[PDB]
Amino acid sequence: STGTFVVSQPLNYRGGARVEPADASGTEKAFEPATGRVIATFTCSGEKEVNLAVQNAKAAFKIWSQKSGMERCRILLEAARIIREREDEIATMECINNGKSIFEARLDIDISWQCLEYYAGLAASMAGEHIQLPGGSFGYTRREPLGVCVGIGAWNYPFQIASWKSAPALACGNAMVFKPSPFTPVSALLLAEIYSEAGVPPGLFNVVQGGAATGQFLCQHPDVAKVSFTGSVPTGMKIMEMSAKGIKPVTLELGGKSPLIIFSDCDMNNAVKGALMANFLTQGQVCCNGTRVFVQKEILDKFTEEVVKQTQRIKIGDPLLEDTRMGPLINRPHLERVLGFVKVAKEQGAKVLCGGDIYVPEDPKLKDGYYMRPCVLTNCRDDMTCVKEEIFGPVMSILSFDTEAEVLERANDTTFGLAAGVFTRDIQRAHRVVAELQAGTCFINNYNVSPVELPFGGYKKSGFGRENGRVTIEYYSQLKTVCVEMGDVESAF
């Protein structure tokens, strides 16, 4: 089914229906990265269209916020059921536009409906407090929604980010206007269609397409109560600056340069597999990837030789093939960026052990796709450009270390702080290393296995706020303190 699809319907979603935008802020083209074709050339939403989206979602927020948590729970569970029933239709579209393998996309759709189910349950038990106060009086808190929340999505995990941002928002009683990445506009509309079929009020989850301008219109609309952003550090900085004009709360996911520390007492088989899962999923375009692979000197050769052997066995090809594990990168400009990082690595003294070059698949229909082979680098130094900056491609930087105290200083020597990983069997070293890692999510003896039940978010310049877990409720709801006087007012005058 690759090289076969092109968008038929309009790409914005309002009033529980698909719509072309009212006014424009540009025209982008979305590609099929496996082939290079243009699946879509569409219009970026202008100010009047963005205003329609927020306003139409504000009317839906009025309806949605009146239901109890259990009542909202019922509807989000139905949306989760429709996602399970349309998983293969959703996943296939996600692959066509994003480029990741069908194998991973099915797992992405799994994490998407599990997020909806998890937050549906959380909605049913959402609560404030009740506190006995002196003199018979008491106080209580109403956990209330915020209003119209804005979600600005990213292209690497398009449908999952739409599900990870909308699920806690709508479960807390909010509506959402979601702006997908211009690279991946298609899949978010399927989630918007699924929410309406599940029975949400029309407008509760609206989709506006666009780029930087559209997102700026969304972050500055006076009726947007909260902004959830996933993207780069420079852009996240801009998102917070725009929200300052309206006193809007912000949560952020800004990528990372997460460390993966492999000690010599580790299970080698798990450490090799873990390093691959920490670097080459979704073409290496994963924010929380363990891209600084620290290997203790005693196991560097055995680890490196095994990692290179398994990396070279990654099947590259048609994303819709069952055995494919790496498809094309998102688009050519990002492929050249990743290839540029590799060229500088060789100039700075790093040794390319495999991959890092253009890949031409056997299938002629994939000739113009944006393919490259996964790359493993060794002889890396903390001062290398490929070691400091997020590459967002399949580029594993292997660095040697000697002592635990040394590697912790190097692991924390970053402005990033999204994720981290340690491979070791010593119980005390495992819990100690993780406690010192300045990162939001830390993996012991695995990687990229973030569950839906626990918070995911950044430390330092990787952002603040969380997705998944219970604490995300605090970012999509707010507590109103209500004091109930049970006696008379004792005046001071």
Ligand X SMILES: NC(=O)c1ccc[n+]([C@@H]2O[C@H](COP(=O)([O-])OP(=O)(O)OC[C@H]3O[C@@H](n4cnc5c(N)ncnc54)[C@H](O)[C@@H]3O)[C@@H](O)[C@H]2O)c1
- For 280-311, b/e burial (b = at least 16 CB within 10 A) is bbbbbbbbbbbbbbbbbeebbeebbebbbeeb
In the 8-state DSSP scheme, what is residue 129? Answer: -
CA distance 160 to 188: 9
Supply the minimum distance, in Å, between the C-beta of residue 55 and a copy of itself.
Answer: 17
Q: Is 232 annotated as a binding residue?
A: yes
Count of residues touching ligand X (by CB under 6 A): 25
CA distance 75 to 119: 11
Supply the minimum distance, in Å, between the C-beta of residue 389 and ligand X.
Answer: 9
445 lines the binding site for ligand X (CB under 6 A): no
127 lines the binding site for ligand X (CB under 6 A): no
310 lines the binding site for a copy of itself (CB under 8 A): yes
Q: Is 421 annotated as a binding residue?
A: no
Work out the number of other CB atoms within 10 angstroms of the CB of residue 145: 23
What residues pair up with 420 in beta bridges, in sequence order? 442
Instruction: Select 338 or 430, whichever has its Cβ closest to ligand X.
Output: 338
54 lines the binding site for ligand X (CB under 6 A): no
252 lines the binding site for a copy of itself (CB under 8 A): yes
Strand boundaries in 123-165, DSSP class E: 130-132, 138-145, 148-152
| Phi, psi of 342, deg, nearest 5 | -65, -40
Supply the minimum distance, in Å, between the C-beta of residue 16 and a copy of itself.
Answer: 25
Which member of 3, 99, 151, 153 binds ligand X (CB under 6 A)? 153
Q: Are 277 and 291 in contact (CB under 8 A)?
A: no
Work out the number of other CB atoms within 10 angstroms of the CB of residue 71: 12
CA distance 328 to 139: 57
Instruction: Select 238 or 273, whichever has its Cβ closest to ligand X.
Output: 238
Which member of 62, 245, 297, 367 binds a copy of itself (CB under 8 A)? 245
Active site residues per annotation: 253, 287
Instruction: Select 78 or 306, whichever has its Cβ closest to a copy of itself.
Output: 306
Q: Is 433 annotated as a binding residue?
A: no
Instruction: Select 405 or 492, whichever has its Cβ closest to a copy of itself.
Output: 492
Q: Is 491 annotated as a binding residue?
A: no
CA distance 390 to 349: 18
Supply the minimum distance, in Å, between the C-beta of residue 452 and ligand X.
Answer: 16
Q: Are 111 and 442 in contact (CB under 8 A)?
A: no
Supply the minimum distance, in Å, between the C-beta of residue 392 and ligand X.
Answer: 4
Binding partner selected for residue 469 from a copy of itself, ligand X, none, CB under the kind-specific 5 to 8 Å limit: a copy of itself
In the 8-state DSSP scheme, what is residue 391? Answer: -
Applying CB under 6 A, which part among 52-60, 70-78, 103-111, 251-259 lies near ligand X?
Answer: 251-259
Torsion of CA 213, 217, 219, 224, to 10 degrees: -150
Count of residues touching a copy of itself (by CB under 8 A): 107
In the 8-state DSSP scheme, what is residue 316? Answer: B
Supply the minimum distance, in Å, between the C-beta of residue 252 and ligand X.
Answer: 9
CA distance 30 to 97: 7
Q: Is 235 annotated as a binding residue?
A: yes
Binding partner selected for residue 131 from ligand X, a copy of itself, none, CB under the kind-specific 5 to 8 Å limit: a copy of itself
Instruction: Select 173 or 458, whichever has its Cβ closest to ligand X.
Output: 458
Q: Are 316 and 324 in contact (CB under 8 A)?
A: yes
Supply the minimum distance, in Å, between the C-beta of residue 20 and ligand X.
Answer: 15
Instruction: Select 219 or 320, whichever has its Cβ closest to ligand X.
Output: 219
**Hey, what long-range contacts does 238-244 have (CB within 8 A, 24 or more apart)?**
239/152, 239/215, 242/216, 243/219
Work out the number of other CB atoms within 10 angstroms of the CB of residue 85: 12
User: What 3-state class would DSSP assign to 89?
Assistant: helix
Segment 165 to 224, residues that bind ligand X, using CB under 6 A: 179, 181-182, 211-212, 215-216, 219
98 lines the binding site for ligand X (CB under 6 A): no
Which member of 55, 65, 232, 310 binds ligand X (CB under 6 A)? 232
At position 342, the amino acid (one-letter code) is V
Q: Which residues are annotated as a binding site for NAD(+)?
A: 179, 231-235, 390
Residues that bind ligand X (CB under 6 A): 152-156, 179, 181-182, 211-212, 215-216, 219, 230-232, 235, 238-239, 253-255, 287, 390, 392
